Amino acid sequence: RPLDIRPNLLVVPTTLRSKAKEVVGVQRLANGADNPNFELVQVLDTAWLN
Amino acid sequence: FMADEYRYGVRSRCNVGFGFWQLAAMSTEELNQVNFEKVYDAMRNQKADGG
């Protein structure tokens, strides 16, 4: 019986914040492509890890 | 005619500033997060005198 998982959090170090925000935070891609992963998961940036 | 003044510059703190040696911005992929925001991230990543 499969399990219902709804990922809504993305935790990354401060060194990956740029990539995390450009995956979730960018609305247009290329010369206009929407973004299927825009605001799908909210990101928090922390300095304790790494 | 003369001017007189008492002053001198200061260093605020060693770990609150940065200067890099490149700025190209060609297509905003050479330095967007390679050397312009790389320093931004470096400032984001620092540790005090307690680990």
DSSP per-residue codes, A1-50: --------EEEEEGGGHHHHHHHSS----TTS---TTSSSSEEEEESS--
Q: Which residue of B has its CA nearest to A22?
A: B33
**Experimental technique of record:** cryo-EM
* Resolution reading in Å: 2.6
B45:A17 CB<8 A: no
A44 part of contact set with chain B, CB < 8 Å: no
- At CB < 8 Å, which residues of chain B contact A? 33, 37, 41, 44-45
Q: What is the DSSP letter of B41?
A: H
Which residues lie closer than 8 Å to B46 by C-beta, 6 or more apart? B15
AA identity, residue A28: R
- What is the C-alpha to C-alpha distance for residues A15 and B47, in angstroms, rounded to an integer? 14
Structure token pair of residue B14 = 């060693």
- Asked if residues A17 and B44 have their Cβ atoms less than 8 Å apart, the reply is yes
